[PDB]
């Protein structure tokens, strides 16, 4: 197996605000997969997929990343930058970890898998 589990992503529960939602994220060898449930995974229905090699840099977030969030959640949330169109446009992905340790593993593992570390 490899880096996999449930990470929280900013979801619009109201309309403009963005809370969290545990989605099944699984970083495959030199690849990143995103799912919403096991039923979708077994059916080969990847909600999202990113290229590890495309990643520019993976590092933890800070209080500046979110305001409504919690100072305790900040250290449990990491950000992953990846090229979407070119370079400067490269977007990022915010993922919250139920435990700080998870953020250290997810980031360290997913980043370690990156070729341009």
Swiss-Prot record:
Disease: May play a role in hypertension. ROCK-inhibitors lower the blood pressure in spontaneous hypertensive, renal hypertensive and deoxycorticosterone acetate-induced hypertensive rats, but not in normal rats.
Effect of residue 20 to A: Increased activity and autophosphorylation
Subunit structure: Homodimer. Interacts with IRS1. Interacts with RAF1. Interacts with RHOA (activated by GTP), RHOB, RHOC. Interacts with PPP1R12A. Interacts with EP300. Interacts with CHORDC1. Interacts with BRCA2. Interacts with NPM1; this interaction enhances its activity. Interacts with SORL1. Interacts with PJVK.
Expression sites by tissue: Highly expressed in brain, lung, liver, skeletal muscle, kidney and testis.
Protein's name according to its UniProt entry: Rho-associated protein kinase 2
Post-translational modification: Autophosphorylated. Dephosphorylation by PTPN11 stimulates its RHOA binding activity.
Annotated localization: Cytoplasm; Cell membrane; Nucleus; Cytoplasm, Cytoskeleton, Microtubule organizing center, Centrosome
Organism lineage: Eukaryota, Metazoa, Chordata, Craniata, Vertebrata
Role this protein plays: Protein kinase which is a key regulator of actin cytoskeleton and cell polarity. Involved in regulation of smooth muscle contraction, actin cytoskeleton organization, stress fiber and focal adhesion formation, neurite retraction, cell adhesion and motility via phosphorylation of ADD1, BRCA2, CNN1, EZR, DPYSL2, EP300, MSN, MYL9/MLC2, NPM1, RDX, PPP1R12A and VIM. Phosphorylates SORL1 and IRF4. Acts as a negative regulator of VEGF-induced angiogenic endothelial cell activation. Positively regulates the activation of p42/MAPK1-p44/MAPK3 and of p90RSK/RPS6KA1 during myogenic differentiation.
Membership in a protein family: Belongs to the protein kinase superfamily. AGC Ser/Thr protein kinase family.
Residues bearing PTM Phosphothreonine: 62
Gene this protein is translated from: Rock2
């Amino acid at each position: 197996s490899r880096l996999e589990g449930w990470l929280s992503l900013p979801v619009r529960n109201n309309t403009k605000k963005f809370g969290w939602v545990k989605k099944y994220v699984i970083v495959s060898s030199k690849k990143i997969l995103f799912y919403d449930s096991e039923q979708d995974k077994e059916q080969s229905n990847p909600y999202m997929v990113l290229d590890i090699d495309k990643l520019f840099h993976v590092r933890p977030v800070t209080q500046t990343d979110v305001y409504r969030a919690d100072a305790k959640e900040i250290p449990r949330i990491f950000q992953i930058l990846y090229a979407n169109e070119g370079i400067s446009s490269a977007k990022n992905l915010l993922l919250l970890a139920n435990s700080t340790e998870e953020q250290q593993k997810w980031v360290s593992r997913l980043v370690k898998k990156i070729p341009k570390k």
